[PDB]
Protein backbone atom coordinates (compact mmCIF):
# COMPACT_ATOMS: atom_id res chain seq x y z
CA UNK A 1 0.00 0.00 0.00
CA UNK A 2 0.89 3.69 0.18
CA UNK A 3 1.29 3.58 3.97
CA UNK A 4 3.08 0.21 3.96
CA UNK A 5 1.10 -1.23 6.88
CA UNK A 6 -1.03 -3.95 5.27
CA UNK A 7 1.31 -6.28 3.38
CA UNK A 8 3.62 -3.78 5.04
CA UNK A 9 5.35 -3.90 8.39
CA UNK A 10 2.28 -5.94 9.40
CA UNK A 11 3.45 -9.44 8.57
CA UNK A 12 0.11 -10.96 7.53
CA UNK A 13 -3.63 -10.97 8.14
CA UNK A 14 -5.59 -12.97 10.69
CA UNK A 15 -8.05 -15.27 8.98
CA UNK A 16 -9.38 -16.13 12.43
CA UNK A 17 -10.72 -12.63 12.94
CA UNK A 18 -14.21 -13.18 11.59
CA UNK A 19 -15.76 -10.42 13.71
CA UNK A 20 -13.90 -7.48 12.16
CA UNK A 21 -11.57 -5.90 9.62
CA UNK A 22 -9.00 -4.68 12.16
CA UNK A 23 -8.20 -5.71 15.72
CA UNK A 24 -5.80 -6.43 18.56
CA UNK A 25 -4.09 -9.62 19.64
CA UNK A 26 -2.60 -9.47 23.13
CA UNK A 27 -0.34 -11.43 25.45
CA UNK A 28 -0.18 -10.84 29.19
CA UNK A 29 0.09 -12.60 32.55
CA UNK A 30 -3.40 -14.09 32.11
CA UNK A 31 -3.05 -15.50 28.59
CA UNK A 32 -3.48 -14.38 24.99
CA UNK A 33 -6.50 -13.05 23.12
CA UNK A 34 -7.87 -11.66 19.87
CA UNK A 35 -10.52 -8.92 19.61
CA UNK A 36 -11.87 -6.85 16.71
CA UNK A 37 -11.96 -3.02 16.71
CA UNK A 38 -15.39 -1.84 15.65
CA UNK A 39 -14.71 1.88 15.12
CA UNK A 40 -12.07 1.49 12.39
CA UNK A 41 -13.64 -1.59 10.79
CA UNK A 42 -16.77 0.49 10.36
CA UNK A 43 -14.78 3.49 9.13
CA UNK A 44 -13.41 1.39 6.29
CA UNK A 45 -16.69 -0.40 5.62
CA UNK A 46 -18.65 2.87 5.49
CA UNK A 47 -16.16 4.35 3.03
CA UNK A 48 -16.20 1.30 0.76
CA UNK A 49 -20.01 1.19 0.84
CA UNK A 50 -20.27 4.87 0.02
CA UNK A 51 -17.92 4.23 -2.87
CA UNK A 52 -19.93 1.24 -4.06
CA UNK A 53 -23.22 3.15 -4.02
CA UNK A 54 -21.62 6.08 -5.79
CA UNK A 55 -20.62 3.63 -8.53
CA UNK A 56 -23.89 1.68 -8.95
CA UNK A 57 -26.25 4.66 -8.59
CA UNK A 58 -28.36 6.05 -11.43
CA UNK A 59 -25.91 4.71 -14.02
CA UNK A 60 -28.63 3.51 -16.38
CA UNK A 61 -28.81 5.05 -19.84
CA UNK A 62 -32.31 5.88 -21.05
CA UNK A 63 -33.06 7.46 -24.45
CA UNK A 64 -34.36 6.40 -27.90
CA UNK A 65 -31.85 4.29 -29.82
CA UNK A 66 -30.81 4.08 -33.47
CA UNK A 67 -30.57 0.80 -35.40
CA UNK A 68 -27.46 -1.05 -34.27
CA UNK A 69 -27.74 -4.08 -36.61
CA UNK A 70 -28.09 -4.21 -40.40
CA UNK A 71 -29.09 -6.99 -42.81
CA UNK A 72 -28.12 -5.50 -46.19
CA UNK A 73 -25.09 -3.41 -47.15
CA UNK A 74 -26.04 0.16 -47.96
CA UNK A 75 -23.47 2.88 -47.92
CA UNK A 76 -22.72 6.15 -46.20
CA UNK A 77 -25.51 6.46 -43.63
CA UNK A 78 -25.06 2.96 -42.23
CA UNK A 79 -21.25 3.20 -42.22
CA UNK A 80 -21.84 6.27 -40.07
CA UNK A 81 -24.31 4.55 -37.74
CA UNK A 82 -21.81 1.76 -37.12
CA UNK A 83 -18.99 4.26 -36.61
CA UNK A 84 -20.96 6.23 -34.02
CA UNK A 85 -21.85 3.09 -32.10
CA UNK A 86 -18.29 1.71 -32.18
CA UNK A 87 -16.89 5.02 -30.96
CA UNK A 88 -19.48 5.13 -28.16
CA UNK A 89 -18.73 1.57 -27.10
CA UNK A 90 -14.98 2.18 -27.04
CA UNK A 91 -15.27 5.33 -24.97
CA UNK A 92 -17.54 3.58 -22.48
CA UNK A 93 -15.28 0.55 -22.28
CA UNK A 94 -12.37 2.86 -21.52
CA UNK A 95 -14.36 4.73 -18.86
CA UNK A 96 -15.22 1.42 -17.20
CA UNK A 97 -11.64 0.09 -17.23
CA UNK A 98 -10.22 3.31 -15.83
CA UNK A 99 -12.94 3.62 -13.20
CA UNK A 100 -12.33 0.14 -11.87
CA UNK A 101 -8.56 0.75 -11.75
CA UNK A 102 -8.61 4.13 -9.94
CA UNK A 103 -11.30 2.92 -7.59
CA UNK A 104 -9.39 -0.24 -6.69
CA UNK A 105 -6.01 1.38 -6.14
CA UNK A 106 -7.82 3.83 -3.86
CA UNK A 107 -9.70 1.11 -1.94
CA UNK A 108 -6.42 -0.64 -1.21
CA UNK A 109 -4.64 2.58 -0.18
CA UNK A 110 -7.56 3.63 2.03
CA UNK A 111 -7.74 0.31 3.90
CA UNK A 112 -3.96 0.45 4.37
CA UNK A 113 -4.49 3.93 5.76
CA UNK A 114 -7.11 2.76 8.28
CA UNK A 115 -4.78 0.08 9.62
CA UNK A 116 -1.96 2.58 9.98
CA UNK A 117 -4.19 5.16 11.69
CA UNK A 118 -5.42 2.62 14.23
CA UNK A 119 -1.78 1.80 14.88
CA UNK A 120 -0.54 5.39 15.33
CA UNK A 121 -3.56 5.99 17.58
CA UNK A 122 -2.74 3.04 19.81
CA UNK A 123 0.89 4.15 20.08
CA UNK A 124 -0.02 7.72 20.97
CA UNK A 125 -2.26 6.34 23.68
CA UNK A 126 0.52 4.15 25.09
CA UNK A 127 2.72 7.24 25.36
CA UNK A 128 6.02 6.42 27.07
CA UNK A 129 5.00 3.11 28.63
CA UNK A 130 5.59 1.09 25.46
CA UNK A 131 7.91 0.69 22.49
CA UNK A 132 7.19 0.07 18.82
CA UNK A 133 8.60 -3.35 17.96
CA UNK A 134 8.35 -2.67 14.23
CA UNK A 135 6.05 -5.53 13.25
CA UNK A 136 2.92 -3.72 14.40
CA UNK A 137 3.29 -4.91 17.98
CA UNK A 138 3.96 -2.79 21.04
CA UNK A 139 6.02 -3.93 24.00
CA UNK A 140 4.27 -2.73 27.13
CA UNK A 141 6.82 -2.26 29.90
CA UNK A 142 4.45 -2.64 32.87
CA UNK A 143 2.22 -5.51 34.02
CA UNK A 144 -1.02 -5.17 32.04
CA UNK A 145 -3.94 -7.43 32.92
CA UNK A 146 -7.04 -8.00 30.76
CA UNK A 147 -8.91 -4.99 32.18
CA UNK A 148 -5.99 -2.73 31.27
CA UNK A 149 -5.68 -4.16 27.74
CA UNK A 150 -9.38 -3.48 27.29
CA UNK A 151 -8.74 0.05 28.55
CA UNK A 152 -6.34 0.53 25.65
CA UNK A 153 -8.72 -1.03 23.13
CA UNK A 154 -11.61 1.22 24.30
CA UNK A 155 -9.59 4.44 24.50
CA UNK A 156 -9.74 5.14 28.24
CA UNK A 157 -6.18 3.99 29.07
CA UNK A 158 -4.43 6.36 31.50
CA UNK A 159 -0.68 6.30 30.97
CA UNK A 160 0.30 8.38 33.98
CA UNK A 161 -0.77 5.49 36.23
CA UNK A 162 1.82 3.05 34.83
CA UNK A 163 4.42 5.61 33.75
CA UNK A 164 6.84 5.09 36.65
CA UNK A 165 6.76 1.29 36.55
CA UNK A 166 7.16 1.30 32.78
CA UNK A 167 9.99 3.87 32.58
CA UNK A 168 11.80 2.09 35.39
CA UNK A 169 11.49 -1.14 33.36
CA UNK A 170 12.63 0.42 30.06
CA UNK A 171 15.70 2.33 31.19
CA UNK A 172 17.46 -0.11 33.55
CA UNK B 1 -42.24 -11.46 -14.83
CA UNK B 2 -40.69 -8.05 -14.15
CA UNK B 3 -37.49 -6.71 -15.71
CA UNK B 4 -36.89 -3.07 -16.61
CA UNK B 5 -34.10 -3.86 -19.06
CA UNK B 6 -34.76 -5.79 -22.28
CA UNK B 7 -32.26 -7.00 -24.89
CA UNK B 8 -32.83 -9.28 -27.86
CA UNK B 9 -31.15 -12.05 -25.84
CA UNK B 10 -33.94 -11.49 -23.32
CA UNK B 11 -34.21 -9.49 -20.11
CA UNK B 12 -31.21 -8.46 -18.02
CA UNK B 13 -31.02 -7.04 -14.49
CA UNK B 14 -29.91 -3.39 -14.31
CA UNK B 15 -28.35 -3.47 -10.81
CA UNK B 16 -24.87 -3.34 -12.41
CA UNK B 17 -23.44 -0.25 -14.18
CA UNK B 18 -22.27 -2.09 -17.31
CA UNK B 19 -23.43 -4.99 -19.47
CA UNK B 20 -21.76 -7.23 -22.02
CA UNK B 21 -24.95 -8.90 -23.30
CA UNK B 22 -26.09 -6.76 -26.25
CA UNK B 23 -25.49 -3.27 -27.65
CA UNK B 24 -29.18 -3.27 -28.58
CA UNK B 25 -31.34 -2.52 -25.54
CA UNK B 26 -34.70 -1.07 -24.44
CA UNK B 27 -35.52 0.44 -21.04
CA UNK B 28 -33.17 1.67 -18.34
CA UNK B 29 -30.10 -0.41 -19.14
CA UNK B 30 -26.45 -0.57 -18.08
CA UNK B 31 -23.98 1.06 -20.47
CA UNK B 32 -22.72 -1.56 -22.93
CA UNK B 33 -18.98 -2.31 -22.80
CA UNK B 34 -16.56 -4.66 -24.56
CA UNK B 35 -15.29 -6.24 -21.32
CA UNK B 36 -17.13 -9.32 -20.02
CA UNK B 37 -15.80 -8.92 -16.48
CA UNK B 38 -14.75 -5.96 -14.31
CA UNK B 39 -14.27 -6.64 -10.59
CA UNK B 40 -14.54 -3.76 -8.10
CA UNK B 41 -12.63 -4.43 -4.87
CA UNK B 42 -14.87 -4.16 -1.80
CA UNK B 43 -12.25 -5.20 0.74
CA UNK B 44 -8.62 -4.74 1.69
CA UNK B 45 -5.62 -6.48 0.23
CA UNK B 46 -5.68 -10.18 1.16
CA UNK B 47 -2.55 -11.44 2.94
CA UNK B 48 -3.10 -15.10 3.94
CA UNK B 49 -1.61 -16.38 7.21
CA UNK B 50 1.99 -17.58 6.86
CA UNK B 51 1.42 -20.98 8.53
Amino acid sequence: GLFGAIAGFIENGWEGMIDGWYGFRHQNSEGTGQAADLKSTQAAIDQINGKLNRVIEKTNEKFHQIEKEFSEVEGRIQDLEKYVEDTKIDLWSYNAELLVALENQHTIDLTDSEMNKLFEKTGRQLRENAEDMGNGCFKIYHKCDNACIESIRNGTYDHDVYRDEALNNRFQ
Amino acid sequence: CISECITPNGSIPNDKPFQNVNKITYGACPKYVKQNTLKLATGMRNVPEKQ
Partner: antibody
Amino acid sequence: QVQLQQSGAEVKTPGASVKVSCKASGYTFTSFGVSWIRQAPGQGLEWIGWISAYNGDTYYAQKFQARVTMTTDTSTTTAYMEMRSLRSDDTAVYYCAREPPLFYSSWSLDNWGQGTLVTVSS
Amino acid sequence: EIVMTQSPGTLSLSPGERATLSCRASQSVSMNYLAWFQQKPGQAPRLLIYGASRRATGIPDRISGSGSGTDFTLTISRLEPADFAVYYCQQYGTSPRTFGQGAKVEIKR
Protein backbone atom coordinates in the same frame (compact mmCIF):
# COMPACT_ATOMS: atom_id res chain seq x y z
CA GLN C 1 -18.46 -24.49 3.00
CA VAL C 2 -16.77 -24.49 6.43
CA GLN C 3 -17.80 -28.03 7.26
CA LEU C 4 -16.84 -29.95 10.41
CA GLN C 5 -17.19 -33.70 9.86
CA GLN C 6 -17.44 -35.86 12.97
CA SER C 7 -16.79 -39.58 13.37
CA GLY C 8 -19.35 -42.34 13.83
CA ALA C 9 -21.51 -43.11 16.85
CA GLU C 10 -19.71 -45.06 19.58
CA VAL C 11 -20.81 -47.63 22.16
CA LYS C 12 -18.56 -48.22 25.16
CA THR C 13 -18.73 -50.06 28.49
CA PRO C 14 -17.85 -48.28 31.77
CA GLY C 15 -14.12 -47.97 32.46
CA ALA C 16 -13.27 -47.81 28.77
CA SER C 17 -11.91 -45.03 26.56
CA VAL C 18 -13.21 -43.12 23.57
CA LYS C 19 -11.50 -40.92 20.97
CA VAL C 20 -13.72 -38.75 18.78
CA SER C 21 -12.63 -37.12 15.51
CA CYS C 22 -13.54 -33.89 13.69
CA LYS C 23 -12.36 -33.27 10.10
CA ALA C 24 -12.44 -29.58 9.23
CA SER C 25 -12.67 -28.28 5.67
CA GLY C 26 -13.40 -24.97 3.97
CA TYR C 27 -11.10 -22.77 6.02
CA THR C 28 -7.46 -22.51 7.02
CA PHE C 29 -7.29 -25.00 9.85
CA THR C 30 -4.39 -23.46 11.79
CA SER C 31 -6.06 -20.04 11.86
CA PHE C 32 -8.62 -21.19 14.43
CA GLY C 33 -9.27 -23.20 17.54
CA VAL C 34 -11.75 -25.96 18.24
CA SER C 35 -13.92 -26.35 21.30
CA TRP C 36 -15.64 -29.50 22.53
CA ILE C 37 -19.14 -29.39 23.98
CA ARG C 38 -21.43 -32.27 25.03
CA GLN C 39 -25.17 -32.61 25.48
CA ALA C 40 -26.81 -35.49 27.33
CA PRO C 41 -30.20 -36.73 26.10
CA GLY C 42 -32.89 -34.13 26.78
CA GLN C 43 -30.40 -31.89 28.56
CA GLY C 44 -28.44 -28.68 28.09
CA LEU C 45 -24.99 -27.88 26.75
CA GLU C 46 -21.84 -28.41 28.79
CA TRP C 47 -18.48 -27.05 27.64
CA ILE C 48 -15.71 -29.67 27.84
CA GLY C 49 -12.82 -27.61 26.57
CA TRP C 50 -10.81 -25.62 24.04
CA ILE C 51 -7.68 -26.14 21.99
CA SER C 52 -5.81 -23.92 19.55
CA ALA C 53 -4.89 -25.43 16.20
CA TYR C 54 -2.70 -22.33 15.97
CA ASN C 55 -0.33 -22.21 18.98
CA GLY C 56 -1.33 -25.53 20.60
CA ASP C 57 -2.71 -23.83 23.72
CA THR C 58 -5.17 -25.74 25.85
CA TYR C 59 -8.01 -24.88 28.27
CA TYR C 60 -9.98 -27.62 30.07
CA ALA C 61 -13.04 -27.26 32.28
CA GLN C 62 -11.99 -28.20 35.81
CA LYS C 63 -14.42 -31.12 35.67
CA PHE C 64 -12.75 -32.85 32.71
CA GLN C 65 -9.22 -31.74 33.56
CA ALA C 66 -8.33 -35.26 34.65
CA ARG C 67 -10.07 -37.63 32.24
CA VAL C 68 -9.89 -35.70 28.96
CA THR C 69 -7.16 -34.77 26.48
CA MET C 70 -7.66 -32.73 23.31
CA THR C 71 -5.38 -32.99 20.30
CA THR C 72 -5.12 -31.72 16.74
CA ASP C 73 -3.41 -33.02 13.62
CA THR C 74 -2.50 -30.30 11.14
CA SER C 75 -1.70 -32.51 8.15
CA THR C 76 -5.19 -34.05 8.28
CA THR C 77 -6.77 -30.81 9.52
CA THR C 78 -8.44 -32.89 12.24
CA ALA C 79 -9.28 -32.37 15.92
CA TYR C 80 -9.57 -35.22 18.44
CA MET C 81 -11.15 -35.50 21.88
CA GLU C 82 -10.20 -38.42 24.15
CA MET C 83 -12.09 -39.30 27.30
CA ARG C 84 -10.79 -41.98 29.67
CA SER C 85 -12.39 -43.95 32.52
CA LEU C 86 -15.93 -43.63 31.15
CA ARG C 87 -18.93 -43.73 33.46
CA SER C 88 -22.50 -44.15 32.25
CA ASP C 89 -23.41 -40.50 32.82
CA ASP C 90 -20.86 -39.63 30.14
CA THR C 91 -23.52 -40.82 27.70
CA ALA C 92 -24.22 -37.85 25.47
CA VAL C 93 -23.84 -36.32 22.03
CA TYR C 94 -20.42 -34.77 21.57
CA TYR C 95 -20.11 -31.66 19.40
CA CYS C 96 -16.99 -30.07 17.98
CA ALA C 97 -17.27 -26.35 17.23
CA ARG C 98 -14.97 -23.76 15.61
CA GLU C 99 -13.49 -21.10 17.92
CA PRO C 100 -10.94 -18.24 17.85
CA PRO C 101 -7.23 -19.21 17.63
CA LEU C 102 -6.54 -17.55 21.00
CA PHE C 103 -8.55 -18.21 24.16
CA TYR C 104 -9.53 -14.74 25.38
CA SER C 105 -10.87 -13.74 21.97
CA SER C 106 -14.08 -11.93 21.14
CA TRP C 107 -16.35 -14.39 19.29
CA SER C 108 -17.59 -17.93 19.96
CA LEU C 109 -18.54 -21.32 18.52
CA ASP C 110 -19.50 -20.03 15.08
CA ASN C 111 -19.55 -23.42 13.24
CA TRP C 112 -20.76 -26.75 14.62
CA GLY C 113 -20.09 -30.35 13.68
CA GLN C 114 -23.04 -32.72 13.34
CA GLY C 115 -22.12 -34.29 16.67
CA THR C 116 -21.40 -37.91 17.52
CA LEU C 117 -23.36 -39.98 20.03
CA VAL C 118 -21.29 -41.83 22.63
CA THR C 119 -23.32 -44.35 24.64
CA VAL C 120 -21.81 -45.76 27.84
CA SER C 121 -23.62 -48.92 28.93
CA SER C 122 -22.74 -52.37 30.28
CA GLU D 1 -17.86 -20.63 38.06
CA ILE D 2 -20.36 -18.29 36.41
CA VAL D 3 -24.00 -19.34 36.64
CA MET D 4 -26.18 -18.67 33.61
CA THR D 5 -29.88 -18.49 34.35
CA GLN D 6 -32.51 -18.32 31.61
CA SER D 7 -36.13 -17.38 32.14
CA PRO D 8 -38.73 -18.30 31.70
CA GLY D 9 -37.91 -21.88 30.66
CA THR D 10 -40.78 -22.00 28.14
CA LEU D 11 -42.67 -19.43 26.06
CA SER D 12 -45.94 -20.07 24.25
CA LEU D 13 -46.38 -17.53 21.48
CA SER D 14 -48.07 -17.25 18.10
CA PRO D 15 -46.30 -16.65 14.81
CA GLY D 16 -46.03 -12.91 14.19
CA GLU D 17 -45.78 -12.06 17.89
CA ARG D 18 -42.54 -11.03 19.60
CA ALA D 19 -40.51 -13.36 21.83
CA THR D 20 -38.32 -11.97 24.62
CA LEU D 21 -35.86 -14.31 26.36
CA SER D 22 -33.93 -13.50 29.53
CA CYS D 23 -30.39 -14.44 30.58
CA ARG D 24 -29.02 -13.40 33.99
CA ALA D 25 -25.43 -14.17 35.03
CA SER D 26 -24.35 -14.89 38.61
CA GLN D 27 -21.67 -12.23 38.20
CA SER D 28 -20.64 -9.64 35.60
CA VAL D 29 -19.85 -11.27 32.26
CA SER D 30 -16.37 -10.14 31.27
CA MET D 31 -16.24 -7.96 28.18
CA ASN D 32 -19.94 -8.63 27.61
CA TYR D 33 -18.90 -11.71 25.74
CA LEU D 34 -22.24 -13.44 25.70
CA ALA D 35 -23.60 -15.56 22.88
CA TRP D 36 -27.02 -16.88 21.95
CA PHE D 37 -27.43 -20.22 20.17
CA GLN D 38 -30.48 -21.88 18.62
CA GLN D 39 -31.13 -25.62 18.55
CA LYS D 40 -33.92 -27.43 16.76
CA PRO D 41 -34.67 -31.07 17.61
CA GLY D 42 -32.13 -33.51 16.18
CA GLN D 43 -29.83 -30.82 14.82
CA ALA D 44 -26.82 -29.07 16.29
CA PRO D 45 -26.84 -25.56 17.78
CA ARG D 46 -26.43 -22.53 15.49
CA LEU D 47 -24.65 -19.36 16.53
CA LEU D 48 -27.18 -16.51 16.63
CA ILE D 49 -25.45 -13.76 18.57
CA TYR D 50 -21.97 -13.08 19.93
CA GLY D 51 -20.56 -10.03 21.72
CA ALA D 52 -24.08 -9.79 23.12
CA SER D 53 -25.48 -7.49 20.40
CA ARG D 54 -23.74 -8.77 17.27
CA ARG D 55 -25.39 -11.02 14.69
CA ALA D 56 -23.49 -14.03 13.37
CA THR D 57 -23.50 -13.93 9.58
CA GLY D 58 -26.58 -15.16 7.74
CA ILE D 59 -28.94 -14.01 10.47
CA PRO D 60 -32.04 -11.78 10.20
CA ASP D 61 -32.47 -8.29 11.63
CA ARG D 62 -35.52 -9.60 13.49
CA ILE D 63 -33.30 -11.61 15.84
CA SER D 64 -31.38 -9.21 18.08
CA GLY D 65 -29.40 -9.28 21.32
CA SER D 66 -29.18 -6.60 23.98
CA GLY D 67 -28.07 -5.94 27.54
CA SER D 68 -24.82 -5.94 29.46
CA GLY D 69 -23.00 -6.80 32.64
CA THR D 70 -25.17 -9.22 34.54
CA ASP D 71 -28.38 -8.82 32.47
CA PHE D 72 -28.97 -9.90 28.86
CA THR D 73 -31.94 -10.24 26.51
CA LEU D 74 -32.57 -12.01 23.21
CA THR D 75 -35.43 -10.62 21.16
CA ILE D 76 -37.32 -11.95 18.14
CA SER D 77 -39.54 -9.31 16.56
CA ARG D 78 -41.72 -11.36 14.21
CA LEU D 79 -41.94 -15.07 14.95
CA GLU D 80 -41.78 -17.30 11.90
CA PRO D 81 -42.29 -21.07 11.98
CA ALA D 82 -38.50 -21.53 11.70
CA ASP D 83 -37.91 -19.61 14.95
CA PHE D 84 -39.73 -22.06 17.20
CA ALA D 85 -36.85 -23.93 18.79
CA VAL D 86 -34.72 -24.02 21.94
CA TYR D 87 -32.37 -21.14 22.78
CA TYR D 88 -29.24 -21.20 24.92
CA CYS D 89 -27.07 -18.37 26.19
CA GLN D 90 -23.40 -18.80 27.04
CA GLN D 91 -20.80 -16.56 28.60
CA TYR D 92 -17.38 -16.90 26.99
CA GLY D 93 -15.91 -14.19 29.22
CA THR D 94 -13.88 -16.61 31.36
CA SER D 95 -12.98 -20.26 31.87
CA PRO D 96 -14.91 -22.36 32.25
CA ARG D 97 -17.36 -21.24 29.57
CA THR D 98 -20.89 -21.76 30.82
CA PHE D 99 -24.37 -22.06 29.30
CA GLY D 100 -27.81 -21.36 30.66
CA GLN D 101 -30.33 -24.17 30.40
CA GLY D 102 -32.80 -24.44 27.60
CA ALA D 103 -35.32 -21.62 27.08
CA LYS D 104 -37.87 -23.14 24.64
CA VAL D 105 -40.16 -21.15 22.34
CA GLU D 106 -43.29 -22.94 21.10
CA ILE D 107 -46.49 -22.30 19.15
CA LYS D 108 -49.53 -21.04 21.07
CA ARG D 109 -52.66 -22.76 19.83
